[PDB]
Amino acid sequence: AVSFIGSTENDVGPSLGSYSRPFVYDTRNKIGYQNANVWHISKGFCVGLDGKVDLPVVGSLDGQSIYGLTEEVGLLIWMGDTKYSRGTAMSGNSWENVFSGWCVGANTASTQGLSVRVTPVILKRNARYSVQKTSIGSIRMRPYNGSSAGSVQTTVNFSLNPFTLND
Ligand SMILES: CO[C@@H]1O[C@H](CO)[C@H](O)[C@H](O[C@@H]2O[C@H](CO)[C@@H](O)[C@H](O)[C@H]2NC(C)=O)[C@H]1O
């Protein structure tokens, strides 16, 4: 089986968080969302994840997209499985495989989770830059091996909480 146990709408990062020192801010996992338990799965269900970023691509760094928020501020974005180190660097605006997948035991149960992580980028200087709450994109479960979603909700959404960068 599969069922949806997570939340449809999800905020990334603490609201009105402040961060200090294209220039990339070292924010680690602070501007993140993580949930180990988004779908409940059982009895041989096989599932991975696709991610999609809806923000405009305004540049590229080391093979991943810089996504634009404002004239001064962009984002590097990762989506993936639960643990932050599993994140896949996002490029472009299409669905992208961000977790190859796994299969829960034929006789047992577990969950499928996810993580979204971003790091702010100064694209252009004015030295205090604020960003408002902004839709980022979505992640969808991707069944495989003949597993079926039925009509279970496949997709969850992410919004960037507002933040301020101090330079
Ligand atoms: C037998 O326990 C299960 O072990 C597998 C690895 O064999 C896996 O770690 C399972 O945990 C889930 O793993 C998912 C895919 O990595 C992940 O998306 C979920 O968050 C994990 N669910 C948890 C940690 O409760 C584990 O149940």
Residue numbers in the entry: 1 to 21, 29 to 133, 136 to 176
Give sentences copied directly from the paper behind this entry.
Surface Plasmon Resonance (SPR) interaction studies using a newly synthesized GlcNAcβ1-xGal series (x being 2, 3, 4 or 6) and F17G crystal structures in complex with these disaccharides provide insight in the structural basis of the variant-specific binding profiles. F17aG is indeed highly positively charged, with three more lysines and one more arginine than F17bG. Near the non-reducing end of the disaccharide, Arg93 (purple) is bridging the GlcNAc residue and the sulfate ion S4, whereas variable residue Asn90 (cyan) of F17bG, substituted for Lys90 in F17aG, is bridging the O4 hydroxyl of the reducing galactose and the sulfate ion S4. The majority of the amino acid variations involve arginine or lysine, which consistently lead to either an introduction or a removal of a positive charge.
F17 and F18 fimbriae are wire-like structures expressed on the surface of enterotoxigenic and septicemic Escherichia coli (ETEC) strains that secrete toxins causing diarrhea in infantile livestock. F17, F18 and type-1 fimbriae are assembled by the chaperone/usher biogenesis pathway and comprise a few thousand copies of a major pilin (F17A, FedA and FimA respectively), several minor pilin proteins and a single two-domain adhesin (TDA) at the tip (F17G, FedF and FimH, respectively). The N-terminal domain of TDAs is a lectin domain, also called receptor-binding domain, because it mediates adherence of fimbriated bacteria to glycoconjugate receptors on host epithelial linings. Amino acid sequence and crystal structure analyses of the lectin domains of F17G, FedF and FimH elucidate a previously unacknowledged basis for strain-dependent glycan binding profiles of E. coli fimbrial adhesins, one that is driven by electrostatic interactions.
